[PDB]
Amino acid sequence: TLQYRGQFDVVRPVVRKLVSEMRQNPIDVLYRPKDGARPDAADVLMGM
Amino acid sequence: MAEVVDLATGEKQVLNDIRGRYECYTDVGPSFQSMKQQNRAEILELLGKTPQGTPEYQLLLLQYFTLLDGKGVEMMRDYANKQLIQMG
């Protein structure tokens, strides 16, 4: 088109924010044993 | 020995158990992943609210006892146990 089209573009900054937050709060898995399982049941698993 | 109590049951064939059931009323509380999870935290709660007195130390050992597998946890959990039994 022929008329000017520009970018105040407010939203990214909040996007980048959130990401920047989730990036430094990794959060992985855990695999606890179980109510009846012997203590060292997961380590194997998690180990890999 | 000539005395005992507190044994579990099979209840052989499918679908059986006494009709003297409901012995558990229903309350609510923070959701836990499993039992060992709850017991763990339930002890932490008990710590802090207790002085550095004796009963404290047991809780403590109890805590290590409850910890789940690891190079670290195993050895200490193992000490914690040894200690606790020897505590009698």
Quickly list DSSP for chain A: --S-------SHHHHHHHHHHHHS----------SSS-GGGHHHHHH-
Alpha-carbon A40 to chain mean position: 28
B77–A contact, CB cutoff 8 A? yes
Q: What is the resolution of this structure in A?
A: 7.5
Which residues of chain A lie closer than 8 angstroms to B67, CB-CB?
A: 39
Burial (Cβ within 10 Å: 0-12, 13-18, ≥19) of residue B80: buried
Query: Cβ–Cβ of A33/B35 closer than 8 Å?
Result: no
| Residues 1-48 of chain A whose Cβ lies under 8 A from any Cβ of chain B | 32-35, 39-43
Chain A, chain B: beta-carbon pairs less than 8 Å apart: 27
Question: Whose structure tokens read 């992943």?
Answer: B33
Query: Cβ–Cβ of A32/B67 closer than 8 Å?
Result: no
Residue B40 φ/ψ region, left for φ over 0, alpha for ψ in the -120 to 50 degree band, beta for the rest: alpha
Experimental method: X-ray
SS3 percent helix, strand, coil of chain B, rounded to 5, is 45, 0, 55
> How does DSSP classify residue B64?
H
Using alpha carbons, list the distances in angstroms from residue A12 to A6, A23, A24. Answer: 15, 16, 18
Rounded distance between C-alpha atoms, residue B63 and residue B41, angstroms: 9
Q: Specify the 3-state DSSP secondary structure of B2.
A: coil
> Cβ distance B33 to A31 under 8 Å?
no
Residue B11 φ/ψ region, left for φ over 0, alpha for ψ in the -120 to 50 degree band, beta for the rest: left
Residues 6+ apart with CB under 8 A from B74: A39, A40
| Residue among A34, A40, A42 minimizing CB distance to B34 | A34
Query: Cβ–Cβ of A41/B69 closer than 8 Å?
Result: yes
Q: In 3D, which of A48, A8, A45, A22 has the Cα closest to residue B68?
A: A45
| Residue among A35, A40, A43 minimizing CB distance to B36 | A35
Q: Return the amino acid letter for A34.
A: K
